[PDB]
Design a protein around this ligand. Sequence first.
Ligand SMILES: *[C@@H]1O[C@H](CO)[C@@H](O[C@@H]2O[C@H](CO)[C@@H](O)[C@H](O)[C@H]2NC(C)=O)[C@H](O)[C@H]1NC(C)=O
Ligand SMILES: *[C@@H]1O[C@H](CO)[C@@H](O[C@@H]2O[C@H](CO)[C@@H](O)[C@H](O)[C@H]2NC(C)=O)[C@H](O)[C@H]1NC(C)=O
Ligand SMILES: *[C@@H]1O[C@H](CO)[C@@H](O)[C@H](O)[C@H]1NC(C)=O
Ligand SMILES: *[C@@H]1O[C@H](CO)[C@@H](O)[C@H](O)[C@H]1NC(C)=O
Ligand SMILES: *[C@@H]1O[C@H](CO)[C@@H](O)[C@H](O)[C@H]1NC(C)=O
Ligand SMILES: *[C@@H]1O[C@H](CO)[C@@H](O)[C@H](O)[C@H]1NC(C)=O
Lengths: 31, 99, 37, 148
Amino acid sequence: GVSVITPGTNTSNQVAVLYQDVNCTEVPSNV
Amino acid sequence: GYFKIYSKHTPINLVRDLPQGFSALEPLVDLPIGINITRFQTLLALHRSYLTPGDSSSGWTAGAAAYYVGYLQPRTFLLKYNENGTITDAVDCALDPLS
Amino acid sequence: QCVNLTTRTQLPPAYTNSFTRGVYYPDKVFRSSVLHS
Amino acid sequence: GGNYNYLYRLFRKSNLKPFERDISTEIYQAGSTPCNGVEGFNCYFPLQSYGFQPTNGVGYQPYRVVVLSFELLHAPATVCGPKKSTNLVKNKCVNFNFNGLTGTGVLTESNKKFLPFQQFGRDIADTTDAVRDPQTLEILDITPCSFG
Ligand SMILES: *[C@@H]1O[C@H](CO)[C@@H](O[C@@H]2O[C@H](CO)[C@@H](O)[C@H](O)[C@H]2NC(C)=O)[C@H](O)[C@H]1NC(C)=O
Ligand SMILES: *[C@@H]1O[C@H](CO)[C@@H](O[C@@H]2O[C@H](CO)[C@@H](O)[C@H](O)[C@H]2NC(C)=O)[C@H](O)[C@H]1NC(C)=O
Ligand SMILES: *[C@@H]1O[C@H](CO)[C@@H](O)[C@H](O)[C@H]1NC(C)=O
Ligand SMILES: *[C@@H]1O[C@H](CO)[C@@H](O)[C@H](O)[C@H]1NC(C)=O
Ligand SMILES: *[C@@H]1O[C@H](CO)[C@@H](O)[C@H](O)[C@H]1NC(C)=O
Ligand SMILES: *[C@@H]1O[C@H](CO)[C@@H](O)[C@H](O)[C@H]1NC(C)=O
């Protein structure tokens, strides 16, 4: 699954993304 | 087999490009044809010069013409309606993470 | 009766950005403040 | 005196394919001898003319014929019969059809304003709750028939 972490659009429009139990070397800054 | 045309006219000031706002397009016609279309071209109007007898490219005068062409793709759009029945804003999912 | 008009221009066409344009009503259906996908 | 302007073909090599048409005027050749574009025995002009005259027994008088052929290729639609209507009643549980929209309920004068290309309105949870009358172009609400 892919999850999106947001502080709320009434605070900011930045976003972070969680790729669930995927090794972070095969996803396709801060990794 | 149908040919559908949608249109809109909007006033803007001196911008180099397409504006930043939002405007929906109301439908004009739904012609029942059944025609196989893969190419198209734009018609331009030229005026006759009267300063030469010939019909060649020197015999027609013209102004300046430019247009913008983009292509449609099957996407999913979330449309926010108004209380009068007017699409005031929208967003295209599969655009970014937040979208 | 038709004319050769095309002059060869070396310049390519430019590219701009359609920010949010080209949205239409895909149905005669009416709506009132209903967020519709 | 005879109306000799109505001709018909009386000789052809082979029967027509359906809906095929042949307006040529070549000299027919019955026998084996070639014709070379001149008449003669076994070389006949292929068109004859009805000489119609007003004192002809029935079955020799001219009849005009029109053959209508309805075809259905594979388009999206086309011409068809005409449509009728009735009298849009109000304030009574009724069984209605608005150019395709089939439903049941009480019809009532509205006070909403569609855009001038929208036919009917829908609710959240997607049920038809308003229509526009095609003939007079006025918006009418559709409320359900009392039940319980
Ligand atoms: C509509 O016309 C196009 C013509 O390009 C058809 O697409 C193919 O085009 C290539 C390019 O010349 C031809 O080599 C192919 O033979 C065409 N396909 C076919 C199946 O003939 C397209 O098929 C046409 N559409 C319809 C519904 O007839
Ligand atoms: C179709 O025809 C009907 C009449 O056959 C039109 O109904 C008229 O509507 C106007 C409203 O502007 C009334 O003032 C008239 O009295 C109506 N006439 C009748 C006989 O009822 C109807 O408007 C026509 N359709 C359109 C789109 O104009
Ligand atoms: C939400 O926005 C309103 C007005 O824009 C503001 O008063 C409120 O503090 C905001 N909430 C949060 C959690 O930032
Ligand atoms: C992801 O793969 C690399 C390469 O083998 C490996 O070193 C790493 O440990 C893997 N991730 C986890 C969480 O083990
Ligand atoms: C459309 O909506 C606006 C507010 O968004 C309202 O003021 C107006 O009365 C409405 N109706 C029209 C323009 O017929
Ligand atoms: C220009 O027009 C002539 C006839 O007037 C024609 O023979 C010629 O092919 C045309 N030029 C081009 C590039 O088509």
